[model samples]
Target: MQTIKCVVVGDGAVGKTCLLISYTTNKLPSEYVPTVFDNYAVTVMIGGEPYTLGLFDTAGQEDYDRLRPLSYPQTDVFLVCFSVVSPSSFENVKEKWVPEITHHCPKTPFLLVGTQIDLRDDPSTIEKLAKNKQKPITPETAEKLARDLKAVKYVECSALTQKGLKNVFDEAILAALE
Candidate 1:
């Protein structure tokens, strides 16, 4: 019954709560309310063994800044999320999120996730939007980001559709064990 503590950190509205809810309870909320410094813990069985996963969904606003230090120390793995629909969230991954992680938990394994993939009606919409915004959203971009941040892995997922959710955690748990 070994436990692996993992934290899901991201700006508000980036699907942090949704991912957690989906993973733990298999429920997704229709409306979004920014997290208000709530910490949730759940255990999942992997390879017929149980692992305790403690998650902190921090408020995206400045009021919850105090919890950052407390949350950082116990985290074994960090799941950094960004929304594909919002380029700014993607940008913050490099500019703000990574730096904060470095300052707090420098050596933890991390994974970069691009969420809201289901928002694109057509699968090719991601490519089109990336081209329109002049931002890279290809597999190469994900790989490059992982390389730059020394991330254990990178994945794009859609919580709404439950697409890639299982794989995300499977990879994460494997990486955490490693």
Candidate 2:
């Protein structure tokens, strides 16, 4: 069986670790502890043939920026993540994350992932963002950015609710094999 290495990158606290835990373990994490270079592996059935999906979770803090790309070589796909309720995180997709990935793996395919969609309509989240005079990143806005950055496509999920989570990795597998 072959292995598809999927590397996830984004701003800190954007739910990158939560996304992996939710998908692989089918449960939400209890806290906001940031990730370093945690790894996960899952056996996926692709057309009845098994493939190992290797997930590499990277920290988004600037402190690890130098050490992050050490895991980049041989990556099959990348998930560039951002929280829907965070405008600055979305801005970094184009400003930082995308550029970083393309620099190391220029031909590697990537998906633009929007996390925390379950909070898009929450009263407290909305109220807090409104205080900053900002709004959540809508699907339309994210899709536009994905197209601009030439991502495989845009995907959104809520690890807390497990909504649209499966499809995110499914899409990654497709991109990986393509």
Candidate 3:
């Protein structure tokens, strides 16, 4: 079987683990235990070809800055994720995550992924961000960043709702094959 290796990176608590678990098992992980560069592989058929997609979950905390890039070697594609409900996580895509990935894999393609889209319109979430004078990230803004940063594409998903979830992996496979 062919293999597509995808490494996920972003700020902590941005739903990286949830994305992978839900994509593979169709159910969320029981808890949000912080990541330590966990990796998972699943066999998926794309365009009639069986593929082992390696999903790597990297710690997004500052503590892993020195160790995270070790997982970048041979990565076919990357899903740089951030929460749509958290503006700071979105900013880190440009300020930190993108730079780190490019430094290690200059020729690799990546998708700008926005997680937690289900909460984008949640009143309590909105109110919390509003209190801090911020708002959920708009798709338009993310798309622009994807273009500006030369990402393969901009994708969004809500693991809780499974909305746009499958497309994230589908797009990653497409980019990897390209």
Candidate 4:
């Protein structure tokens, strides 16, 4: 059986693990600590052959940036995550995340995942952004960024309201087939 590896990376404490789990395991792993890499996997069959689909969670804190890229090579897909309410995370996706991904895995593909979609209209969240003369990121903006960055596409979801979640992960797994 072949193993397909998918790595998730983004800003600190922004639900990269939560997103990965809710979409797959229906629960987040306990203790939710950063720094060291955490990996989860499941058996999947494609074309009558079994494969291991590995989800590798990475720390996004600037301090762990060096260590985290240690888990980047030989991976098939990357979920370049950022919070919808946190524009700074999105900037890192552009300036830091994408560069590091392409630098190490130059020929690989990835997705720009706008997480915390439930916060785009949170009243306090909006007011806080306005206080700093900024606004929440929109799907259009993220999608544009994805196209500009040469990712497969932009996907998004909620950690709050887990219902009605689509199967973009299904797309991920299917795209990773090789």
TM-score of each: 0.68, 0.71, 0.71, 0.67
After TM-score superposition, the amount by which residue 13's alpha carbon in candidate 2 deviates from its true location, in angstroms, is 3.6
Which parts of model 4 have CA positions greater than 4 angstroms off? 1-3, 24-39, 44-51, 61-74, 120-134, 160-166
lDDT of 1 by residue, 4-123 (tens): 666666666556455555454343444543355454576667576555666554346424666555552566677776665555777677457788778774486776666654343325
Question: CA lDDT, every prediction?
Answer: 0.58, 0.60, 0.61, 0.57
TM-score for predicted model 3 compared with the true structure: 0.71
Q: How many backbone clashes does candidate 1 have?
A: 0
Q: What is the Cα-based TM-score of model 1?
A: 0.68
- Give the higher-lDDT candidate: 1 or 3: 3
Per-residue CA lDDT of model 2 for 1-178, tens digit only, reads 2457676667765665666654543444445434564546776663554556665443674346565566626556776767776677788865677776677655766666666653633455667767555565665877777777577755665555345446455554565556
lDDT (Cα, tens digit) per residue for candidate 4, span 68-108: 56552555777666777667877777667687667765566
User: lDDT by residue for model 3 over 1-178, one digit each (tens)?
Assistant: 2467776677775565666654543533344533455546777775665556666543565345565565526657777777776678788865677777777655666666666653633455667756655554655777767767577656665445344546455554555566
79 in model 4: Cα distance from truth in Å?
Answer: 1.2
